[PDB]
Amino acid sequence: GPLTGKVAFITGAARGQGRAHAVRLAADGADIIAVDLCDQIASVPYPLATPEELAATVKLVEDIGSRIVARQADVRDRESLSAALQAGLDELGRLDIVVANAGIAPMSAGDDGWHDVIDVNLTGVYHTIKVAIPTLVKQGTGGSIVLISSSAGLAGVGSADPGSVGYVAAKHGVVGLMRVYANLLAGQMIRVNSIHPSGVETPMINNEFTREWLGNAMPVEVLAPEDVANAVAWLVSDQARYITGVTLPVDAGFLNK
Amino acid sequence: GPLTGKVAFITGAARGQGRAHAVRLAADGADIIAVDLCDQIASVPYPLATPEELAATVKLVEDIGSRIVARQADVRDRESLSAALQAGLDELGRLDIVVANAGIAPMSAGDDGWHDVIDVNLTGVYHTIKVAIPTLVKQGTGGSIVLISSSAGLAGVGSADPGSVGYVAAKHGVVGLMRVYANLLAGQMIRVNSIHPSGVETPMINNEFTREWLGNAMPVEVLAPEDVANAVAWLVSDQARYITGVTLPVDAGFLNK
Amino acid sequence: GPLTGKVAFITGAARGQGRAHAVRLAADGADIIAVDLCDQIASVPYPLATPEELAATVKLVEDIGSRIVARQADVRDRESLSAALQAGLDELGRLDIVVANAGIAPMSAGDDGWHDVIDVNLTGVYHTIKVAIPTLVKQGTGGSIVLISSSAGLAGVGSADPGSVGYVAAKHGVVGLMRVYANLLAGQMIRVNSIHPSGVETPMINNEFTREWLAKMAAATDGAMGNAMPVEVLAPEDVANAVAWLVSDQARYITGVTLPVDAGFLNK
Amino acid sequence: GPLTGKVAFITGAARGQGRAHAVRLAADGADIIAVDLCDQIASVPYPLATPEELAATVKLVEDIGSRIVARQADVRDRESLSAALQAGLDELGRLDIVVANAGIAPMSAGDDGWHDVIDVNLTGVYHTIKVAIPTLVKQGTGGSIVLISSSAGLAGVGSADPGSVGYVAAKHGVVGLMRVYANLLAGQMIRVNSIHPSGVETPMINNEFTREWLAKMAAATDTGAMGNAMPVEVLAPEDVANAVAWLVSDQARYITGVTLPVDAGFLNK
Ligand SMILES: NC(=O)c1ccc[n+]([C@@H]2O[C@H](COP(=O)([O-])OP(=O)(O)OC[C@H]3O[C@@H](n4cnc5c(N)ncnc54)[C@H](O)[C@@H]3O)[C@@H](O)[C@H]2O)c1
Ligand SMILES: NC(=O)c1ccc[n+]([C@@H]2O[C@H](COP(=O)([O-])OP(=O)(O)OC[C@H]3O[C@@H](n4cnc5c(N)ncnc54)[C@H](O)[C@@H]3O)[C@@H](O)[C@H]2O)c1
Ligand SMILES: NC(=O)c1ccc[n+]([C@@H]2O[C@H](COP(=O)([O-])OP(=O)(O)OC[C@H]3O[C@@H](n4cnc5c(N)ncnc54)[C@H](O)[C@@H]3O)[C@@H](O)[C@H]2O)c1
Ligand SMILES: NC(=O)c1ccc[n+]([C@@H]2O[C@H](COP(=O)([O-])OP(=O)(O)OC[C@H]3O[C@@H](n4cnc5c(N)ncnc54)[C@H](O)[C@@H]3O)[C@@H](O)[C@H]2O)c1
């Protein structure tokens, strides 16, 4: 495949879009370093991933034919995340692609929702970049860093809940991370871009809370996780070698409507 | 390939990026309706394409194994452009993809440069869209319209020459066409996006005038026409089925620098 | 006032927003060079200004106490526009502020609508900038160029009509003009910015016709056409007040900006 | 003046731009609720404001002829900030204008710089909005909320230092706060906008650490890419205060959801 011999580090890889990236990039030949919390955060009113789900991602990727290192780790904890990445490096010996995908959407928790969404969705993305840079720079072969933002990183879409205004703030902060790192790493031939999905059919929105709590331009209800994985697989390939500093909506026209 | 059975209408197909689109989309299985002015505009201080160059594109596409209908046509003349497209529809029977690529960069012609760049780069893009819509809508199978803008469509980069100011104004106007047509056509599952290259190695910039007249974030001097064609080939594929309303820089970080 | 001793050149000054700029900047002490077509363009489905309306602007500004030179001129015709500007310069002796406000919204005219809206709303703005630059540069005291775009200069809001997609294209092109001229002219301390109103109560939209089309746009969309704040329409004075700030010393270092004056429409 | 009978809550009011906002809005007739940390933060290598400076802002505003309630408060501590605002509400009886101006620029502190800059410049701005909303909504007379971002809120103007990356991320996050609150509050006629200065002449820009940062950033680029477009070395605090005074006035009654550069053309360059 176009990614044979490369290694992709993916946060939130136990299910949802993170699993879709693991499967898609492995299908294209990449080996995978997969991390997920595999535990609950109290301000999040829907279940986060289980250890069983991370093991399921591992089986899918192994069946495709790639090597995979999978660790439980929390993106909020730099030492934890660094240790997990280093386990992947010890086994696979290189790093080419980073997909900073782990995220949460807390609600109905008061300001705990603000703090937790900033911590996972902004600080955790910072940590994901920071733990990867020294390897990418030392290797001297360029690479790709893909940050997962949202429509809410470019538009004021949300409710008054602290976790929702925090989600908007965090996802906007992720665009800032993208833009500064695209500038800092361009000289190293490391591309940095952000992806902005509107709604995607995953357990972040397919849950009891969201149904009880509860439009794109194209007549598309919700995107598939594969739509997001397909965009990312293009971006990290040689077909997109000179694409950097871009905010890419994958959204059936939502941001332009 | 992924585009077998589809037809792509490409303006400015005689050379440069237009040729690169014709070759890349044909390699993916598409048949081609190729048009070019194949004549000079007096305000443009470098040579435009010749009839022989359009014939050379035809040979390349036929050698790849796709069908191609090529006509001389001026994007400024709606009737000319419509007749040319119709020659292609009469032989190939359908239309799926439109690449509004023809463009000029006049200089040193005073206000004739202003007029000519608006007429080719803005009015000509409107005509390219307008003549394609009836077929796409009557078919009812969706499609893709790709408008070629520039860094100068999103940033104030230019000199005081009326042809240069006009290039900025026209390429900005192309973004506006993209945004309104993406909204107008979303219901028909017709995606509309714009591409924003910075510099590309073609005879628009590789000529005697430009040498006499006298950077990106990544250490890349100029992009290849293939870089722009690679982006477009992805956009018009099912891998980008829900991408619409986007301004996509293909620019080694120029717009983010 | 804060603009005493300065001169403002305003296109489309016979009525509407252009008249509002003339009276607002005159109230702050500016003298005025006012131009308008004062004639109809066949693709435009509502009446353009009359000669009597331009004369009425002149009286309003004289009653305020400023000097004003007014001429019938077409922004599409650089020579017409330059002659009119020069009549104003001969009388007032300087130029400080340019407001490129003339514009049209053709509809239901076929491709004549495309060509006319590009010609007035984009080429006419270019002409307005180009006739003014030499004076501003020769004086060496800086100045302000204010281009009137629209929400449709930053968003794809329009209908399936050559005049409407042309309005979007033109108003987006006006942002381009702003951005490149802000860079070209910054070294001369000439500020260049664009203003983006949503709907403003003038004869351009205060007609049966526009309300028809708004109703169809509304029905065709899944309050999409409405502002974020509960404000039905902005006053011309809202746009004139923004411009009066921008061209003052209170905004001396504001350049290269797209400024929405829109009750939150673009952010909605 | 145009703001006679109005009350403006300003964070970081002890010196710099915050003092300039207090003086400028007072000159237009407003009464002021002024808060500042009046203390140091270890990751910030230059001095923050002193209690003396806050008392000097009080003197300036009283001399202009307005009433002012000033309190020491940390925007990172929602309860502290709420208590300070309440002290001003208890005395002045209303609120019309919020200027979320307090901010820091940590550097050479490792990841403590990341955490502190997010905490002050993003979380602190959230707290400033949150403590003001109930009063604004209960009054039912509209109002203005102005968030102070930066060029670095719209462009990736930063170095690799965690405090700098964090400054870019936080200032971008402020735009997000603006956009969502403009939508949430529009129905109440409460305008929300953000201001994006480039460089402004205050201790944040002229200390030796920032100076060395600016020199390093200039040397890293091949393009005077760190300068403004107009030949203006640095903006005055009054340039930012003048823009805010306009925005909160009836001359800008329908301006909301806008990112406003005040930057001598920097972002467009
Ligand atoms: N689902 C949507 O509609 C949608 C829309 C736009 C953007 N996004 C974003 O896409 C990303 C992927 O989310 P998803 O839709 O696949 O939802 P998801 O909840 O199915 O997946 C998120 C994953 O991240 C993990 N995770 C959460 N906190 C973590 C932490 N502290 N450390 C390590 N792992 C952590 C979860 O356990 C989970 O497996 C997120 O950044 C999210 O904000 C989602
Ligand atoms: N080359 C660059 O650096 C660069 C950078 C950004 C964007 N662009 C854009 O890329 C597009 C392709 O240009 P290119 O780089 O391949 O340059 P090019 O000059 O090699 O190709 C442009 C082609 O369009 C044709 N054309 C010009 N006017 C025409 C008309 N009135 N009707 C029909 N055909 C006409 C030419 O004859 C030519 O074959 C243009 O829209 C251009 O503005 C180029
Ligand atoms: N009214 C709105 O809702 C709205 C919203 C956003 C932007 N705009 C823009 O505001 C500007 C002012 O328009 P308005 O609302 O006051 O409408 P208006 O029709 O009342 O005023 C426009 C004026 O320009 C004149 N004019 C038109 N073409 C001309 C030409 N070729 N040369 C010289 N003068 C010409 C008219 O005769 C008229 O007096 C325009 O650029 C318009 O596109 C209007
Ligand atoms: N100076 C520039 O060039 C520049 C450029 C763009 C944006 N900004 C921003 O302008 C705003 C004002 O900064 P300034 O230039 O006046 O600098 P400054 O350092 O002179 O003023 C900042 C003030 O905020 C206070 N403050 C800091 N942390 C606090 C906290 N936790 N709680 C309460 N008060 C706190 C300080 O003590 C001080 O009085 C900041 O948001 C800053 O990021 C500054």
Residue numbers in the entry:
A (entry chain C), B (entry chain B): 7 to 220, 234 to 276
C (entry chain A): 7 to 228, 231 to 276
D (entry chain D): 7 to 229, 231 to 276
Sentences from the paper on this structure:
Here we present a series of TIGR03971 SDR crystal structures from several mycobacterial species which contain an insertion in the primary sequence at the NAD cofactor binding site. These crystal structures demonstrate that the inserted protein residues almost completely cover the NAD cofactor, only leaving part of the nicotinamide ring exposed to solvent. NMR experiments did not show exchange of the NAD cofactor, whereas binding was demonstrated for a number of small molecules which could be potential substrates, products, inhibitors, or artificial redox partners. Experimental results are consistent with the notion that the SDR family enzymes linked by comparative genomics studies to mycofactocin do indeed keep their NAD tightly bound beneath a protein structure that may interact with a specialized adaptor machinery for redox exchange.
With the exception of the M. thermoresistibile target which did not contain NAD, all other mycobacterial SDR target crystal structures contained NAD, which appears to have co-purified with the protein after expression in E. coli. For each of these crystal structures, the adenosine mononucleotide portion of the cofactor binding site is enveloped by the inserted residues and only a portion of the nicotinamide ring appears open to solvent (see representative examples in Fig. 2A and B). In addition to the insertion loop which covers the adenosine portion of the cofactor, a second loop which typically contains two α-helices covers much of nicotinamide mononucleotide portion of the cofactor. In contrast, this loop is ordered in each of the mycobacterial SDR crystal structures presented here. The combination of the insertion loop which covers the adenosine portion of the cofactor and the ordering of the second loop which covers the nicotinamide mononucleotide portion of the cofactor results in a significant decrease in the solvent accessible surface area of the cofactor in the mycobacterial SDRs, relative to other NAD- and NADP-dependent dehydrogenases. Only a small portion of the nicotinamide ring appears available to solvent in each of these cases, indicating that the NAD cofactor is tightly bound and potentially non-exchangeable. The structures presented here have a cofactor solvent accessible surface area of approximately 18 Å2, whereas other NAD- or NADP-bound dehydrogenases have a cofactor solvent accessible surface area of 82–89 Å2. Given the encapsulation of the NAD cofactor by the two loops in mycobacterial SDRs, a large conformational change would be required to release the NADH cofactor after a redox reaction had occurred. Alternatively, these structural elements may not allow for exchange of bound NAD/NADH with free NAD/NADH.
